[PDB]
Design a protein around this ligand. Sequence first.
Ligand SMILES: [Cl-]
Ligand SMILES: [Cl-]
Ligand SMILES: [Cl-]
Ligand SMILES: [Cl-]
Ligand SMILES: [Cl-]
Ligand SMILES: [Cl-]
Ligand SMILES: [Cl-]
Ligand SMILES: [Cl-]
Ligand code: NA
Lengths: 333, 333
Amino acid sequence: PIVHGGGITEAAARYGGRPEDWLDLSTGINPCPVALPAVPERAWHRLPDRQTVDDARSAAADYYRTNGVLPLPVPGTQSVIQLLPRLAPANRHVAIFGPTYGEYARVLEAAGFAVDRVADADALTAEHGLVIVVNPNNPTGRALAPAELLAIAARQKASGGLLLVDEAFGDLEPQLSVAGHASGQGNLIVFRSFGKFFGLAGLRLGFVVATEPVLASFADWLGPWAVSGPALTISKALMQGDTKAIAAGILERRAGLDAALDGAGLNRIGGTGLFVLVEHPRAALLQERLCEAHILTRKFDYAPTWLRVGLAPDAAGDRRLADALARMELLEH
Amino acid sequence: PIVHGGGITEAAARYGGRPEDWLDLSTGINPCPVALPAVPERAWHRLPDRQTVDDARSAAADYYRTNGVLPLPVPGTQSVIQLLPRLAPANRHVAIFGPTYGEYARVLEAAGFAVDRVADADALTAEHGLVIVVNPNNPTGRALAPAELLAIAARQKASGGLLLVDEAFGDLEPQLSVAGHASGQGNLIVFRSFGKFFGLAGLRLGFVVATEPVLASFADWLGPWAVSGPALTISKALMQGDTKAIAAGILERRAGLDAALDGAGLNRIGGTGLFVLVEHPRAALLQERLCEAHILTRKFDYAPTWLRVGLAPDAAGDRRLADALARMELLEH
Ligand SMILES: [Cl-]
Ligand SMILES: [Cl-]
Ligand SMILES: [Cl-]
Ligand SMILES: [Cl-]
Ligand SMILES: [Cl-]
Ligand SMILES: [Cl-]
Ligand SMILES: [Cl-]
Ligand SMILES: [Cl-]
Ligand code: NA
């Protein structure tokens, strides 16, 4: 399997300490979780009712500005990633803009698809029945403009190709979103994530924006009661609340992280509101040394000079990171 | 799709009333939800950690008496039903003891398997690569003894067949369970459900008990972070608590339902602690008339004389049902 960010259990087992003493900078989750809305006993007790679902879907249509399309709630983005083998044309390649989140290639290659890693729209052909872009990208933060994405979609449509845009990290940049273009474009699918922006990744919740035939396919494949009642209640309440304050809080924490990393002499080469990509010639060794300080960060086997650093919850965490960098022992083995 | 129990949204739309005024007797959920344990902010905020998972798995191993096998948490039983097409031998039939929960046949036939409906172990052959028994059965409550199940498993093993036992309704009858026999039997898989017994079906949580190769297959197919952090926290706490009082409460509510149904002159032909199966020559019309009283019950297109009635939450609900039966208008259209 892929070693995703968030592995505090394994890190604390390997490097010591109690998990709650660790500073976890290895994910892209909002470090300051929004306050929980009320969840009535009924929502805990009953199989999730159609009304609970529909309320969540209307709230999501408003929040993601989907131009009337009701997004489909799904139990976490992984659950629909794993259904992409049923939607992608089976005798065509899949083009993935990368380097990116590795579950797309893992899932599609396990299902026997040929996956082409690409970086530019210029590498896209009619052999690509599905094109995947994480926008903005994880882990580089690269952002394609809406018009580039729609031009990609239009070019693939001529051969019956689909474009999937995973906007997991797009809540801070609503002007990049193509979630309003599903009806007009026709061959466009958008994934949205709930846990990262709202800081409640303990819930497993995502949304799909697509045409009705495609949404009906996803619904059928996922089966009844796929998404928990609490998740649907919480996302309705929070999407109807004040998300501007959430975004402003995130940007404040990101300014704090920038100052810590810059003041430590590290080279920031990308990121989003929720994480920074650092390049350093001994990045893997930096990750290990930070672990020895009980600070977890994300490294990548395919990019030995990359380190992805998520936000700290407060200025004391920023300073904890800076001090660990300043006091770190030789970067040799 | 199948019209499962719990459809209060649709019923209230068709027959009027506010959903919270309806008496929902159309499911098999414990009508008296257990009190919620504490869920620390950390469990809401973080992607579900390996430690949270492992704690839930150890609690489930103790609670289901699995003889050392760590059950795999899954996001609701439907999520592993939908993976049965990947586990069943692809060029063999599937035998399903029925009439039963219809998702097994729906999922397996959608995947191109030939499904044989059976009622007796005597109809089982080597052509059956997978045999499915819901035990005790939904909706009849039929119970096979552990020794009959193990004899079925042993007979299928000779041809490399698997036996799946869905013990969704087995928490009240722990002496029927074969969840302790996975290592010794080798070709046995057990599904357990969380929402029904504990009355918290808003959470989507089940467990799989199987050999390690099979559990590792399910884990890989489900992908990372499949089960919510709150669900895993709650099930650990509640499985370690006092489940005897939960069972006793359920049996009290079931005695109340029996008295209501018997005193109304209805013929009970089966059930479990969590529901009663009634036979009546105009069952479908009874279901419609109860809907007119804003009481929802479960009918079946394949059994026009069957009505499944779940528990009411209190004696006032029992009396509401009895009065609706006593005052109901002509059972003709
Ligand atoms: Cl230690
Ligand atoms: Cl809109
Ligand atoms: Cl991502
Ligand atoms: Cl458009
Ligand atoms: Cl009304
Ligand atoms: Cl045991
Ligand atoms: Cl069932
Ligand atoms: Cl045994
Ligand atoms: Na949940």
